[PDB]
């Protein structure tokens, strides 16, 4: 598969690129103001979130959240290492991104106000599309036309662009958003399986039922402007399986397309 | 639209 077209063919499921090249403003779509369920991505709006907290609380990401035992859910392979120790804000942060531990969402969600605070947060940058209405795990549910947990491809990469290449963080902040998006290390087999020798990238992954199977970030190309990405995939049947190389050929059409 | 941010607010 080289289009978005025979991609979606081959893989069956529903298929959604917003792919923006930041030296001209074009961008490469499929799908791209559908909704799909965006399950483990949300997770960088949620670390933008906070990091605008720390900015009106300075000293915040320094914080030590400590949690029992039984605040746990399940996929919380970072948290659960830490109930003797806690976490620091920060840490916290950096174990939903980079992990998608579940654990470290819902406490980072408590201490900002909930669900309805990542939404929140999300207006204030410009997106009125993107809704995050349930606490980690139920948010990756990926029921066919469901509207709860839900955002367009669109919609993320341009609060993606915004939060990462743009102003909506102060530059600490947007540096320390950046670091924690880079050192994914959940991403392997989706953006980063896609992308050029030498090109740096920063990036959120999901999974959730009916094989939902998505990843959005930035990619730094050595001698060119950023661009920026967001895929979301899902499926028909609810057992469906993720398909990491739908997301990393979806990266490379994307790529060719707008070189 | 105005009724496309009204649909992202409203309640399932």
């Known amino acids: 598969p080289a289009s978005f077209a025979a991609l979606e063919r081959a893989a069956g499921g529903r298929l959604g690129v ?81 992990y998608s531990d579940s654990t470290a969402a819902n406490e980072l969600m408590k201490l900002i106000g909930g669900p309805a605070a990542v939404t929140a947060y999300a207006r204030s940058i410009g997106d009125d599309t993107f809704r995050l209405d349930r606490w980690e795990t139920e948010l990756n549910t990926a029921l066919p036309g469901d509207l709860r947990d839900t955002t367009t491809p669109a919609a993320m990469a341009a609060s993606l662009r915004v939060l990462v290449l743009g102003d909506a963080l102060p530059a600490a902040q947007r540096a320390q958003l950046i670091e924690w998006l880079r050192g994914n290390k959940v991403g392997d087999k989706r953006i980063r399986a896609g992308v050029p020798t030498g090109w740096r990238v920063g990036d959120k992954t999901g999974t959730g039922d009916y094989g939902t199977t998505n990843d959005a970030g930035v990619l730094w190309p050595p001698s060119r402007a950023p661009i920026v990405l967001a895929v979301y995939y899902t499926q028909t049947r609810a057992d469906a399986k993720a398909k990491d190389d739908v997301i990393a050929t979806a990266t490379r059409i994307a790529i060719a397309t707008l070189g | 639209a105005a009724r496309d941010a009204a649909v992202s607010d409203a309640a399932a």
């Open chain 1, 18 to 98: 917003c792919a923006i090249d930041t030296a001209t403003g074009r961008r490469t779509l499929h799908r791209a103001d559908e909704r799909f369920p965006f399950c483990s991505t949300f997770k960088a709006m949620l670390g933008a979130a906070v990091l605008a907290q720390s900015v009106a609380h300075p000293g915040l990401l320094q914080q030590r959240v400590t949690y029992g035992r039984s605040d746990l859910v399940s996929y919380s392979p970072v948290t659960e290492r830490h109930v003797d120790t806690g976490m620091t804000v920060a840490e916290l942060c950096a174990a939903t991104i980079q």
